[PDB]
């Protein structure tokens, strides 16, 4: 029942479990490979507001983990530190041997609070959370992941990362509010249309034009100024 | 069955990372004490969409999820590492799990070269 | 060897529970977030004692315990999931782990249909 | 050495490891199955006094777990909360991923004390404690199990549960005393001949005839009034 | 490839310990409750250097370490129990993972006794 | 790539992965065996000063464990309790299911301190730490191990132990100092040339000739008086 990909006639196809192809040759277990593909590569929105709406909390379902051997360099990964309003953790510590996804251009680190109405956080579309060669059905605290799915195949016989920090309230609900963090006291209201590159230029021009908070209080700026990646309030304008 | 990419988009290039178990390391780099940290065990490569294999693979992983999710729901194993080995076993059982009836469609024994052997011996006799 | 139920009693009917990995779920019920809780993943069935198979099976499980217990004593693995896969491997090795001598008792290659093939070619020639 | 069941001549048999049957066909790993059968089905006494005498404590033996895929609906299961007289736990918490046996008509929940003279509790006859598709050599705290044994086979090509609570002293010894609990202050001296159905009728007639304790003290009643299931003291009469 | 013991010394005798899963225990010693503690599950034996096998084995284990270490670096599995089963699978795939061309070097099917069978039938006809 | 040992022509050899030997017969998984061989058997020095210099601390590398089925009776094993000067442990508790190496003539138990400049202690030559049928890349606290390496093979178709206690300072560095412990207040400066048998005779003659400390203070003695095993200070002379 788990589909196995095989190449026939210059085309990848699913192997027919009911039809024996004696021409197919499997000469060692090395020819079998498991691959994790990123949801990114299918065109899903990757901004934090859009991505988090794909995740939700559920009780009663034991988490499950499956390994995979090769993965895809991600443009967007995520790393969550979510607590309830009373300060208890919403996500479990990463189990022994589960490390973060190894290749992320941008790590979106989200801290904040939500009601977290369930024991584990699952992908509402059935996808996996991809970590270091281990795909999980649930999200682990403080551990970088990419959203993805796993394929199984029979083959024929530098790295820069940047962390983008955000604060959240009402995480995991309809009315989630997100702030992009410039420093511990300067924030920008986050909109879905803001790209990672835009947030990094927004950060740099705030630092250089001195629009950071020079008080002890919290300064929050507002801003109002179809293409995939591979192809004290105020205002600014 | 054929694979029909039904995704809204397809990144036609696969910049991938993996490990190399074969290693054949330089000097002493295979010794854990001296070798790379967890961050430095990865190789990389780039594959383009020849024969439409990258978009096919994205669709295949998408279509695999349901059966894979149903499998993980039914196992009591916390971390599953045995899927590929079990597929290798099932590859062998499909061909060799019963008596191999030569010339039968479910028997991958080719007697051609030996048919020509017996044939030439008969031409002699 | 034959199985002789030596128990004081035998419940001749087996009301069983199991899982179905095949699933083929309705709509979105395969998604873990939406699917059943741990209590609701089970199917059920009822098997009666045709051919004495239920009482045979009760006796078989009883008789299996010693060898299974000795196996678990000798493994350092905390949870053993590999017994059935190893039995599948041993099934294949018993038949294919050496050279298959055709017509020999330890070789499950049936050359009947091809013997009749060569035979009809000889009748022609 | 582990026996494998196979059907020949309309009869289940153990496969001869020394004799190759080329007629036997194994076309996938799906044809191989592991089954857990309940000791119940062999005629063993299932009342709490009789069942607990089959279990005992032992040190020096590491616990072991093996999985099984299909099980049998149980009439009787057990769930133990045993402490030493000094309040330390006698049984280990269930390991991650070990859940209770899924189909139990009656769960006999036993709380109380014993000397617990060993690190783990084993089955004195060599049987297993069957949990959710995992069979263990030992008993876990507060986790429903059935007593059973495992078979391995090559195949040819609603649910109601009721918890019955008991208190125990001297658990795991010769002189174990058991009480059936009607409420936190009303108990019945337990005898081996009392069936689950009898205990549930005994409970209901005590509740309805007002023979529960109407004081702060502990009321204990005594009672003196070959067939398998599939086929302040006082007195009452 | 041949094995050349290049160690400074070689203990030519192997006093070894292992377990016996086969057991076939006396009476009730297979029951975990009654059987041996962890310290008493071991058998022992002594092997001498006939055919140079002990010094060969010491060298072999030494030479295995690099490939074994590179394998463990690349697995995410915390405790690896599957190496021997995977080698058994690869043993079978090397011989039976493709069509078996009889008389071909990569096909372990021996048709000798049946060649003499067909031959005697031809001598008759 | 992992070599497999096989016997051809009255000689153990590595199986050629590129050459199929149809004559080779594997009739069950029982013919496959994994063996742990002791570094001892290759002639390495086994005194505590020489052995410990082969181990070192490293961060960033996840530990790994592989099982083996048969092992070799060891003359020398080791058991380490090392702390930092501030009393924090240097080595992790043994994971569940990892027990000490089962056959050791002499267990060298070493307690003391070092800087422990890394998360785990590895073998600097790439060897394994052999425990009870589990080989690890790292050292576990208080758990007897032998240094060894693992082979894989296709086969053709009483016990006395003695613990020797030592104290260490500067463990895991160039300038490590070792004392052999006679009692909690009597020690001998340890030299590399001291064999286990010599240390046990040294201990016994100190006990019988009354050269143990009869004060509350710490008495330390100094001593100045090519063959493998299978073939308050002061002075003594
Ligand atoms: C495998 O690939 C499939 C196709 O890309 C993925 O299908 C997605 O399935 C989810 C349900 O699990 C759908 O979510 C629903 O969306 C509607 C909103 O309408 C949306 O529909 C269009 C498509 O016509 C989509 O492109 C727009 O963004 C619309 O917003 C909600 O009302 C539902 O409540 C639910 O959220 C996705 O719409 C659907 N995507 C597509 C492109 O069809 C499937 O999830 C993939 N499987 C895995 C495991 O990743
Ligand atoms: C597989 O099936 C076997 C047969 O049903 C089970 O055999 C049981 O083995 C235990 C020992 O492990 C015996 O327990 C002993 O019993 C005597 C008491 O005498 C009893 O003997 C009769 C049988 O003639 C039995 O039916 C009565 O209830 C008697 O009370 C004690 O003195 C011993 O100390 C020890 O407790 C069982 O008697 C025996 N049962 C039967 C029916 O023979 C075996 O346990 C099963 N294996 C597993 C793993 O479940
Ligand atoms: C497999 O067997 C090999 C041969 O027995 C082992 O080789 C050892 O490899 C280590 C490096 O990992 C060497 O350590 C170096 O030693 C020098 C000191 O010189 C020493 O060289 C002679 C050999 O000519 C040796 O016998 C003396 O004791 C000398 O002291 C240092 O400068 C380096 O920094 C490093 O420590 C060993 O010397 C070498 N041994 C031998 C006998 O060649 C190999 O480790 C084994 N593999 C495993 C996994 O155990
Ligand atoms: N031992 C070194 C090598 C070991 C094999 C590694 N290949 C992979 O992971 C494979 C190859 C590279 C990459 C990731 C997987 C699947 C893949 C592919 C894509 C589409 C159709 C079919 C296949 C794409 C082939 C590359 C490094
Ligand atoms: N994929 C859905 C199905 C997958 C297979 C499932 N069969 C089992 O577990 C099997 C079948 C049903 C039940 C439990 C096991 C063993 C069994 C049996 C009993 C006596 C002799 C021989 C066999 C009895 C056959 C039923 C659901
Ligand atoms: N079931 C009881 C027995 C099961 C098999 C056990 N053999 C081993 O472990 C084997 C045999 C004994 C010992 C340890 C391993 C490898 C060995 C060897 C050495 C050199 C070359 C080739 C092989 C040496 C053969 C002995 C007990
Ligand atoms: C969330 O959605 C709207 C606000 O956007 C609200 O009216 C509704 O009640 C909420 N629904 C749930 C399920 O929380
Ligand atoms: C910002 O706050 C976090 C925790 O609240 C702290 O770890 C970090 O050092 C702070 N940064 C600065 C520049 O003070
Ligand atoms: C924002 O700009 C400052 C100033 O150069 C820089 O130090 C900081 O790292 C930037 N933040 C991010 C997330 O790039
Ligand atoms: C102080 O902060 C204000 C905003 O409150 C910012 O506009 C300004 O640049 C800062 N001061 C200077 C001198 O830049
Ligand atoms: C338990 O059995 C009797 C009481 O029933 C008692 O005399 C005996 O000493 C006890 N035996 C053990 C082993 O505790
Ligand atoms: C009985 O006591 C237990 C604990 O002693 C408690 O959990 C339970 O709520 C009590 N029941 C009633 C009716 O008071
Ligand atoms: C005993 O009877 C009362 C009264 O109906 C009921 O509430 C309670 O659950 C019963 N106990 C059991 C164990 O059935
Ligand atoms: C009060 O408890 C007594 C036993 O002490 C019981 O027999 C009686 O039914 C209870 N009272 C009433 C009025 O029922
Ligand atoms: C250790 O070796 C010598 C002392 O024996 C010392 O001079 C040197 O600096 C030390 N080296 C390291 C790497 O600690
Ligand atoms: C020596 O000291 C250790 C701990 O410091 C202690 O466990 C042991 O009992 C002591 N031995 C004697 C003879 O006092
Ligand atoms: C040292 O000698 C004493 C006296 O016989 C003995 O009790 C002690 O166990 C010995 N220590 C060792 C390590 O053998
Ligand atoms: C007391 O200890 C001394 C060393 O300080 C030792 O030489 C002597 O044997 C001990 N006393 C006696 C009477 O033996």
UniProtKB/Swiss-Prot annotation, chains B, C, E:
PTM statement from Swiss-Prot or TrEMBL: Palmitoylation is not required for its function.
Sequence segments annotated as region (Fusion peptide): 23-38
Effect ascribed to mutating residue 31 to A: Reduced infectivity
Phenotype when changing residue 34 to R: Almost complete loss of infectivity. No effect on transport of GP to the cell surface and incorporation onto virions
Coiled coil feature spans: 53-94, 114-125
Membrane topology: Single-pass type I membrane protein
Known outcome of mutating residue 55 to S: Induces GP1 secretion. Complete loss of virus capability to enter into host cell
Top-rank taxon, per record: Viruses
Outcome reported for the amino acid change (mutating residue 27 to R): Reduced infectivity
Effect ascribed to mutating residue 31 to R: Almost complete loss of infectivity. No effect on transport of GP to the cell surface and incorporation onto virions
Glycosylation sites: 62, 117
Subcellular location, record wording: Virion membrane; Host cell membrane
Effect of residue 34 to A: Reduced infectivity
Disulfide bonds: 10-55, 100-107
Its job: Acts as a class I viral fusion protein. Under the current model, the protein has at least 3 conformational states: pre-fusion native state, pre-hairpin intermediate state, and post-fusion hairpin state. During viral and target cell membrane fusion, the coiled coil regions (heptad repeats) assume a trimer-of-hairpins structure, positioning the fusion peptide in close proximity to the C-terminal region of the ectodomain. The formation of this structure appears to drive apposition and subsequent fusion of viral and target cell membranes.
Protein name: GP2
Gene (name only): GP
């Amino acid at each position: 029942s788990i589909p196995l990909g095989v190449i026939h006639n210059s085309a990848l196809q699913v192997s027919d479990v009911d039809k024996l192809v004696c021409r197919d040759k499997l000469s060692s277990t090395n020819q079998l490979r498991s691959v994790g593909l990123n949801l990114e590569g299918n065109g899903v929105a990757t901004d934090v507001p859009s991505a988090t709406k794909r995740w939700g909390f559920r009780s009663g379902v034991p988490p499950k983990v499956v390994n995979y051997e090769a993965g895809e360099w991600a443009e967007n990964c995520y790393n969550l530190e979510i607590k309830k309003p009373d300060g208890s953790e919403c996500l479990p510590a990463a189990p022994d041997g589960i490390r973060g996804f190894p290749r992320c251009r941008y790590v979106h680190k989200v801290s904040g609070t939500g009601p977290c109405a369930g024991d584990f956080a699952f992908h509402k579309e059935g996808a996996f959370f991809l970590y270091d060669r281990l795909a999980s059905t649930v999200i682990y605290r403080g551990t970088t992941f990419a959203e993805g799915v796993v394929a199984f195949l029979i083959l024929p016989q530098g790295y820069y990362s940047t962390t983008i920090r955000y604060q959240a309230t009402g995480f995991g609900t309809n009315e989630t509010e997100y702030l992009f963090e410039v420093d511990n006291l300067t924030y920008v209201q986050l909109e879905s249309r803001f790209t990672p590159q835009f947030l990094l230029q927004l950060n740099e021009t705030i630092y250089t034009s001195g629009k950071r908070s020079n008080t002890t209080g919290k300064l929050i700026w507002k801003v109002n100024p179809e293409w995939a990646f591979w192809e004290x309030x105020x205002x600014x304008x | 069955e054929a694979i029909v990419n039904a995704q809204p988009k397809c990144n036609p290039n696969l910049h991938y990372w993996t490990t190399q178990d074969e290693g054949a390391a330089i000097g002493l780099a295979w010794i854990p004490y001296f070798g790379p940290a967890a961050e430095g065990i990865y190789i990389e490569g780039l594959m383009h969409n020849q024969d439409g294999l990258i978009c096919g693979l994205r669709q295949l992983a998408n279509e695999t999820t349901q059966a894979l999710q149903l499998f993980l729901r039914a196992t009591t194993e916390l971390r599953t590492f045995s899927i590929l080995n079990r597929k290798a076993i099932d590859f062998l059982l499909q061909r060799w799990g019963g008596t191999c009836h030569i010339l039968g469609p479910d028997c991958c024994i080719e007697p051609a070269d030996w048919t020509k052997n017996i044939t030439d011996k008969i031409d002699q006799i």
